[PDB]
Ligand binder design. Sequence first.
Ligand SMILES: O=C(NCc1ccn[nH]1)c1cc([C@@H]2CCNC[C@H]2COc2ccc3c(c2)OCO3)ccc1F
Ligand SMILES: *N[C@@H](CS)C(=O)OC
Ligand SMILES: [Mg+2]
Lengths: 60, 621, 339
Amino acid sequence: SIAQARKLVEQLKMEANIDRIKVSKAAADLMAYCEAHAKEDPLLTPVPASENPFREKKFF
Amino acid sequence: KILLPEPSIRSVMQKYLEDRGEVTFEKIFSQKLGYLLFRDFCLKHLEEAKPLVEFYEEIKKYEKLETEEERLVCSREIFDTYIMKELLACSHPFSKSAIEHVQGHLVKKQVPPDLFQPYIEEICQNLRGDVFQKFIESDKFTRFCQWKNVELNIHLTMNDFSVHRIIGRGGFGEVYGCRKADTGKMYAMKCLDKKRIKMKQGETLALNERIMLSLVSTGDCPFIVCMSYAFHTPDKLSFILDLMNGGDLHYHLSQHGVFSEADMRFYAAEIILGLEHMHNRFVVYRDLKPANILLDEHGHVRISDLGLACDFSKKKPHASVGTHGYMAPEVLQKGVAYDSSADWFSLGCMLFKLLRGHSPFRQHKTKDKHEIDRMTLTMAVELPDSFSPELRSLLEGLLQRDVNRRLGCLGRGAQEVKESPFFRSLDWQMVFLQKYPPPLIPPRGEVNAADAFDIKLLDSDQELYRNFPLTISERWQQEVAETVFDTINAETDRLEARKKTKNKQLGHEEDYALGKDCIMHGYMSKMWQRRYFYLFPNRLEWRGEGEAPQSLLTMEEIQSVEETQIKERKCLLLKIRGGKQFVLQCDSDPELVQWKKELRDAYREAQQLVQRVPKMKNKPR
Amino acid sequence: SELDQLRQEAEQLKNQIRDARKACADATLSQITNNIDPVGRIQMRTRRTLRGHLAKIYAMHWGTDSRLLVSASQDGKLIIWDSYTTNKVHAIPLRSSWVMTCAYAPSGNYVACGGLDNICSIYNLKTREGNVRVSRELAGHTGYLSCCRFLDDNQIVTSSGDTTCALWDIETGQQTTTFTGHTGDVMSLSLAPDTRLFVSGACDASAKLWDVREGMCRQTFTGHESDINAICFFPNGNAFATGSDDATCRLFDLRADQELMTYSHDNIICGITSVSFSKSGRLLLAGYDDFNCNVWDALKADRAGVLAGHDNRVSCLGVTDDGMAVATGSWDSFLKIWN
Ligand SMILES: O=C(NCc1ccn[nH]1)c1cc([C@@H]2CCNC[C@H]2COc2ccc3c(c2)OCO3)ccc1F
Ligand SMILES: *N[C@@H](CS)C(=O)OC
Ligand SMILES: [Mg+2]
């Protein structure tokens, strides 16, 4: 397995050379996505019962 | 009456049999019912197979043909049809050596019974394999299983028979004539009393009889009282033997008086072939005397009561055992071994008694047994002048005091007796076929025909008799074949085609086991509610009739599968995870065996398998 | 000792990566989101129960219509339900009892499933003939199938206990691309929205990000203490969730290339069997071996609610594309649909 631990290294090189970003921004982008679309999320912003298959919608 | 199972029993029996390697061609072809359903398949459902079975059947008939002239004619009829026609049709799948064996033998007008034997082997060759496999794929192997299930679940009682008038009475028991209800086959039922056996200390006698019977009751021997079944009741041992309602030669020697040379010769031959049968299978009869030879309706004879006989393949016996007038010198010598020679001196003694009305060493009605024993050893009996010189060389040969000089001892056995000048008129083939006319035909419905000159029991006693019940396969399969087999196969056929037209009309056609990974499926009952079961690698589903299964158990949740007893019957006992219990009852002894097997194989298998799967095993809680 | 200098270059390179990330670690999501209002009390209720399977359910999957779902059980069967009525669309008895996973094609046209049979079997639900038939079997893997997902009607990614994933071509029946990398059984995979990328969790306690086309492991995320059983992309495609035997879920960011958050609680001791986001990404639903599903505030790590419905293990779950409902599937043999 001398052939094999050399393949692990050439892999780790790939994992290291990447453009990273600050956690601060990452989090900022997630949080901003969540608020962007929170009105389109029925689990947070309920819809009317008549438009909900699982409450009161009659026609399909 | 015999009711067969349903074609769904295949799934269980095929597995039962495969475990024992009885789903091969040799094991099925060589059974009577196996042969018959196989024959049927090759004759009616597979165009390549019919001329091979047809030919087979034709040779088998040729083998039975009595006269040399019949053979010459039949052999050329077999040649020109199954060799020459097949060959001109470019349709003869058989070797050169096979062809040239028969053609060689025919052109020289040699037509022995065995002539066709290379073709028996090469027919078998072409039947086993592709043909056999399609036969397993067919309804007929389905039907074989339906039949072979009924066989492996035989349990007899008195109520399976219909007992008629007595036909014998000895020291330990008494024989009756009966009918087996389901086939309507006539038999004799021996009924030995347990209470008497214990009282006279003949557990060794009763026991030895059954082991001995079993060792002789295959092959179809006309001249011994062979056994089809043995069984127990609360206080009786019952053998089911060949019916013989014509009394015994000791009773008939009383009525008729002595016989002639011609008349004793008849009884001689039929007895000699009886002895020959047991000596091929390494059994010495020993207790050969006229009281032990029996008669059918027609006046043909059989050898009876094998208690005092014993096996000699393993260890040649040395005791003096048997009746005193007719034992051999080496039998009476203590510490001296003996083989089949005991009987040929006995024969000689019995044969004299038929002619002269006493044992040849019992001189003057003398009960002094140790005078009959010293005349046997010192005296070479003098033979009256009346006796023919052909009769003398026989009786002298048979009553040589040395084993090294006696007839049938010099190495060729019965064949040395058959070759005596006394029997020079006889065709032994025709003796075997029972063709010679018997002397005494018994009077119709005679009273006292085959009679003799004559505390409790614990569990500890009946532990002797718990490996008593037996059923000889060859014999049961014969009985069936010659009575009900045909009409039941036709009854069961109409019955399974009416349920087809019914289950098609009601919708339920598609079978739930197919295209899946079902291990085994069949009927069982659970507490009793009867359902149909399907056993998969990871669960046991079940259904009622006319639905799909809506219920199951998993192989995970089964903890052990044990065998318990409920209401005088044997059952399976599944302990389930979380202490709950499942009980299954089965329709037959083979089904019970195989379910128990296949459930245990399955749950051990599954649990092992699941353990190695993170997404399926149990984890800590 | 070429094996010693490569076993020392590994431990060294590993630390280079630790450093590049600890330098991006300037704030915490918890800090960044400390200000936004909490989500509330989520009291979803059972709106449908789905009776049918005869034993444990192991897996399920919503169709893109947010209405039909496919479910895979120990009873050796796939059921395809119409959530709106509880009607069965199809019951599909299988060739193998040992099934573990199932998947519904985006189109509507096929479903897939697999197990200890070691083969992803494609089924066609609209044959010319109008019957549900196996239209393909995808043999290749040398271990059990634990999850699969379609890209389209001709392509499917699988993950096996042979420690590998693979993109197939359903016509050719062969592996277009093999994804070797994991050191232990691969339990779950999730596709990015654009389907040019996907992530996988494994019993080696790591998740991996792969490229569909170029076929290599781009990034590797550690931190879990124990087998990762499920994994799930966050809707924008930039982050993913995981669920482990260690009794935690975790959120991982792709560009920051490290763990942003941990969802857990000292009351919670059982392991996670499945994860799923609500539509906006704000809620993170998680299925557990204590017979509950927990709703987490993805941003704030608060536990917003509990779906408490089944009498055995919640084994699987999922939110509908239109966001309207969530389904759970348990070892109690029932699915339930909630909101
Ligand atoms: O007690 C008898 N025999 C001794 C013994 C003990 C254990 N095994 N054998 C016995 C003997 C006879 C008679 C006694 C006179 N010699 C013939 C013999 C056998 O009788 C028959 C009579 C009819 C038969 C049959 C045998 O087999 C088929 O049909 C009848 C019933 C018996 F129980
Ligand atoms: N309900 C109909 C349209 S009115 C349908 O197509 O399904 C949502
Ligand atoms: Mg002796």
